[PDB]
Copies of this chain bind each other. A is one copy, B any other.
Amino acid sequence: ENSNKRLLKQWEKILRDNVLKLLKNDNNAFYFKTPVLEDININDNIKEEYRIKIKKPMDYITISRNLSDGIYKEPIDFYHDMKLIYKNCIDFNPDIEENKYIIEAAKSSDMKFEFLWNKWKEKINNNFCDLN
């Protein structure tokens, strides 16, 4: 919520505006916006199951916060976290009719993210100095 005066690096700006911005508010974003373990809409029994089973829970708001705070040391650390959101959904939720929308939303967003990462990886690598 607090205003961040920290100046984002050019590679961090590309991930924020050209990759994350187009995914964080799309038609398949709804279930991946806020964290699972602190969401009031999910019952306590599923939240207990998620905390015990999921190694690292990930969502769009955590990524927006990490990108703002300068948590990622390399652009690939953002890639791994974005991929983690969709990978956690497929691994936790069983492939059944009641989970049809959520499994499709995770699969489609992963494909959409991979396109956006492939389209921008050239400029991302060019704006990132690994030697400094």
Contacts and interface: CB of A to CB of B under 8 A. Distances in A.
Nearest to A112: B111
Contacts of A104: 26-27
Chain A interface size, as a band, is 10 to 19
Given A27-B27, A27-B28, A28-B27, A115 B105 contact: no
A20 to B, nearest CB: 14
Contact of A116 (B22, B101, B105, B111): B111
A114 interface: yes
A108 interface: yes
Interface string A69-89: 000000000000000000000
8 contacts: A26-B104, A27-B105, A27-B108, A28-B28, A28-B108, A111-B111, A111-B116, A118-B118
